[PDB]
């Protein structure tokens, strides 16, 4: 899906497999968090389906023993002074010492501020003991979390469930066309992109000699030259787009390990999965009821949330007993209006726009008793469209490696751009998730005093009861980062800013800051930064000391009666789009043993009417709806055509018959050596073996199994 999903697919520990466990008969004591997982396996990230607790992720600092046991690094402390020597220990040994906590008050000289410290004892219990017998310490916080869980700011303010959901949903974002980087994030993004492997990094120092959109030529310092090629508009395993772009000039000097080109979801070397949007938190006219989202129309005009998706089609020209199939232009009788895009020898032209039902490659197959031929060309499935990017043709004449009995193989690539629309799914890093319920014009959204409309509206009834208030903290800090600040320290420094590092007392508009996972900004520092923020181009301050603004009403013009919480938030677009989920059917292919419709979208398939829906129908008392559902719409082979004819001609719907499934059941029971019979009111078992009945085919058109030819 993106670099993070690939980087996390590896670094995955699985309990299932040959010689392991079972997905159903697993239990409840093996799917739990053990006190020995601290530092070795992340307790937060895991699936929430039937695999919960049976799949996990390695922690950031862990490694693997030669025997196969996981180890973690500890810093050794002797006689009350914390040294700088690191030793890797495994759980067997870690149960023999006393290990302190990562965030303890070191006195800048190797001694703890307060003797009483929380330590982990032998059996995994945590106890408060004087700082006198400790002999090891954690190397740093965030040592117990994985790589995907270390990219969530303000993680210690969220509950475990929503944090797990956010960690899982960060791996589903689709690459966008711009990919800007977060305003407020953690420090883990730069390393998680270089080590994923979706960027180009210089191998040796040199002076860049030439740069284009195709390659980068670097002239090393010892007279050698090296050229890097780039992959443009390359399809991914999941249908997305993989692109790389140079970010160097024509005279710059580079160094070993420096980043040279970008990737799918990368911005200047940092991982970037979403966009920064202006958020107001309030209920609005009921269009954001029950986790729905309201969006602006500037995100469609300016292509803020847009992505490219690619698709691939295949066809083969194989041999057969009656002859050989060949792709050509001389198709049987079909209008010459549809043979226009096809080039001189079959396959379509590059750059041609195609729609559902168009021909891609024209193949003709010998029909059979010459001139006996049939049309089996490659069409475009239902509901698909887009340009044609490339065509790949293999042949047996030029000695190409192909399976036996195939002379030619053709693949066609089709790409399309995709804008945001109602039904698409959005999410945040803190477990937020919803679908777009409405898209509003720009001129009827709440706007600030200077006239800037908001971009997205999030309801206020879902925050308090889910226990994820890291999002409002992120909103406040994002507003402060966007606008900039300056702490006034002319006469001393404020009491709340004593611990703030210098160079963090002043910021310029559109700054980028970092908040590590378990030690970042406190609420005192945030409350202090909210009170010293720079004004806009006019001497105006839009947001007060509480992080709330006064908005206007876009449809009536009257200001709202109370101030509202406004800020900036990082939103990502998930790969659950409503274009891959809409489906409808009236008549199509059927099965073979039982004559019921096929299932799925790939083939025109019907929806299963299960057992519990039958219970509901029987409880309602609807005796004709159920009978019609189970006989003429599913299984009655003779009632389907009569129903179609009656509907087309406007007469009354006839009565059902006997479905095929009952007949198949009777045949199987007889095949088990059982004498099943259907009796009449006076004996004389019914024949129930068809007969010489009307065999007429009216209505001409095929009921729907296949399409209709001109």
């Amino acid at each position: 899906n993106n670099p993070l999903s690939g980087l996390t697919h590896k670094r995955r520990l699985s309990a299932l497999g040959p010689g392991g466990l079972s997905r159903e008969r697993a239990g409840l004591e093996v799917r739990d968090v053990h006190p020995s997982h601290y530092g070795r396996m992340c307790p937060i990230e895991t699936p929430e389906g039937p695999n919960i607790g049976l799949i996990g992720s390695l922690s950031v600092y862990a490694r693997v023993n030669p025997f196969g046991f996981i180890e973690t690094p500890y810093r050794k402390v002797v006689d009350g002074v914390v040294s700088d020597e690191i030793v890797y220990l495994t759980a067997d040994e870690e149960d023999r010492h006393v290990v302190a906590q990562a965030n303890s008050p070191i006195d800048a000289d190797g001694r703890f501020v307060e003797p009483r410290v929380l330590v982990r004892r032998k059996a995994g219990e945590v106890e408060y003991v004087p700082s006198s017998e400790v002999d090891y310490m954690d190397v740093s916080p965030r040592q117990m979390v994985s790589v995907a869980t270390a990219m969530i700011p303000f993680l210690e303010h969220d509950d475990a469930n929503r944090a797990l959901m956010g960690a899982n949903m960060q791996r589903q974002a689709v690459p966008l066309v711009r990919s800007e980087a977060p305003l407020v994030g953690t420090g883990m993004e730069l390393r998680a992109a270089i080590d994923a492997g979706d960027v180009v990094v210089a191998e040796e120092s040199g002076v860049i000699e030439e740069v284009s959109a195709d390659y980068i030529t670097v002239m090393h310092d010892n007279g050698t030259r090296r050229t890097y090629r780039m992959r443009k508009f390359a399809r991914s395993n999941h249908g997305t787009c993989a692109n790389q772009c140079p970010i160097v000039d024509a005279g710059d000097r580079v160094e070993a390990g420096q980043v040279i080109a970008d990737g799918p979801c990368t911005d200047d070397g940092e991982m970037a999965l979403g966009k920064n949007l202006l958020v107001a938190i309030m209920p609005w006219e009921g269009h954001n009821y029950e986790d729905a989202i309201i969006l602006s129309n500037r995100l469609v005009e300016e292509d803020v949330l847009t992505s490219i998706h690619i698709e691939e089609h295949e066809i083969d020209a194989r041999d057969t007993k009656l002859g050989a199939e060949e792709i050509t232009r001389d198709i049987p009788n079909i209008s010459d209006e549809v043979l226009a895009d096809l080039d001189e020898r079959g396959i379509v032209r590059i750059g041609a726009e195609v729609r559902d039902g168009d021909i891609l490659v024209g193949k003709v197959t010998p029909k059979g008793e010459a001139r006996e031929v049939r049309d089996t060309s490659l069409k475009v499935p239902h509901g698909e469209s887009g340009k044609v990017i490339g065509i790949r043709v293999f042949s047996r004449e030029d000695e190409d490696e192909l399976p036996a009995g195939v002379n030619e193989l053709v693949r066609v690539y089709v790409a399309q751009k995709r804008k945001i629309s109602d039904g698409d799914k959005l999410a945040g890093r803190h477990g937020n998730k919803g679908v777009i319920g409405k898209i509003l014009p720009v001129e009827d959204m709440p706007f600030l005093a200077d006239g800037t409309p908001v971009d997205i509206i999030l309801n206020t009834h879902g925050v308090p009861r889910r226990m994820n208030i890291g999002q409002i903290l992120e909103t406040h800090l994002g507003w402060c980062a966007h606008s900039g600040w300056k702490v006034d320290a002319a006469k001393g420094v404020p009491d709340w800013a004593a611990r703030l590092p210098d160079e963090l007392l002043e910021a310029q508009p559109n700054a980028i800051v970092s908040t590590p996972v378990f030690d970042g900004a406190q609420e005192a520092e945030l409350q202090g930064l909210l009170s010293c923020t720079l004004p806009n181009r006019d001497g105006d301050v839009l947001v007060d000391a509480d992080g709330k603004a006064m908005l206007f009403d876009g449809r009536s013009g009257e200001p709202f009666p109370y101030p509202v919480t406004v800020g900036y938030m990082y939103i990502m677009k998930l790969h659950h789009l409503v274009d891959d989920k809409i489906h409808a059917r009236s008549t199509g292919p059927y099965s073979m043993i039982t004559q019921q419709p096929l299932g799925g979208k790939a083939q025109f398939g019907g929806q299963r009417f299960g057992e519990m829906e039958c219970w509901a129908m029987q409880a309602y008392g609807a005796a004709y709806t159920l009978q019609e559902l189970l006989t003429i719409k599913s299984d009655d082979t003779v009632g389907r055509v009569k129903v179609y004819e009656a509907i087309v001609k406007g007469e009354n719907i006839p009565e059902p018959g006997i479905p095929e499934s009952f007949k198949v059941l009777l045949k199987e029971l007889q095949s088990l050596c059982l004498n099943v019979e259907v009796l009449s009111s006076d004996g004389a078992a019914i024949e129930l073996r068809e007969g010489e009945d009307e065999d007429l085919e009216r209505a001409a058109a095929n009921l729907g199994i296949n399409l209709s030819r001109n």
Partner: peptide
């Protein structure tokens, strides 16, 4: 830090890391 051309992203962290990832 430690990467030749990384962008500047100031941090709120108070502690020091003896070991790199």
């Amino acid at each position: 830090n430690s990467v030749p051309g990384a962008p500047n992203r100031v941090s709120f962290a108070k502690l020091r890391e003896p070991l790199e990832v």
